[PDB]
Design a protein around this ligand. Structure first.
Ligand code: VCY
Length: 188
């Protein structure tokens, strides 16, 4: 076959019931995640190949960057709670990996202030139980699939993307292979 379990994707031995359709994990400390988001725009090319109005879900993970990595997961919860993902994804990646000016929770917050989120709004969300459950949801989702590496994408709790079995001589070909596989998997 042209798509085979073990090549473009792997199949989970313990399926995850009731999982989100397209579920993507990343870390703002992850160099490959910087690439997927800044250079390759994986998330966005995937969305463009799925049925309109499908649920793409993206979660931060804790297992990179120690204390600040956990801070970043709470800020991703804030971002999600306020719907400002599109405003802070780029500054956050660049602050962690490009300028390396994100060294503390205060520096994370600066990204939001600079992005135009009011301090009161940020601090209120940061400290809210809505954000605390949304941290919990990100952690639970990662736990369900026993996630030890990012970037990572899962379709319907059954299929994991295997980008190691795809061609990287061309950034655009790689992306489309990736997006086409997600689409094929979502139709299975
Ligand atoms: C051509 O355009 C570009 C521009 C920038 C980067 C890339 C690129 C190339 C290869 C890989 C691989 C794996 C491999 O060695 O094949 C991974 C990856 C993904 C998720 C988890 C993981 O950990 C096991 C590894 O990400 C990649 C990105 C391509």
């Amino acid at each position: 076959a042209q798509y085979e379990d073990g090549k473009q994707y792997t199949t989970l031995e313990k399926p995850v019931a009731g999982a989100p359709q397209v579920l993507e994990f990343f870390s703002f400390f992850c160099p490959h995640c910087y690439q997927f988001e800044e250079v390759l725009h994986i998330s966005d090319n995937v969305k463009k190949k799925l049925p309109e109005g499908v649920k793409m879900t993206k979660y931060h993970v804790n297992f990179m960057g120690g204390d600040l990595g956990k801070d970043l997961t709470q800020a991703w919860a804030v971002a999600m709670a306020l719907g400002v993902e599109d405003k802070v994804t780029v500054p956050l990646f660049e602050g962690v990996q490009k300028t390396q000016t994100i060294r503390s929770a205060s520096d994370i917050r600066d990204v939001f202030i600079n992005a135009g989120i009011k301090g009161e709004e940020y601090d209120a969300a940061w400290n809210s139980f809505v954000v605390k459950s949304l941290v919990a949801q990100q952690e639970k989702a990662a736990a369900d699939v026993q996630l030890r590496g990012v970037p990572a994408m899962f379709v319907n709790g059954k299929y994991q993307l295997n980008p190691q079995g795809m061609d990287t001589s061309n950034m655009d070909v790689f992306v489309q292979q990736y997006a086409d596989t997600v689409k094929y998997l979502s139709e299975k």
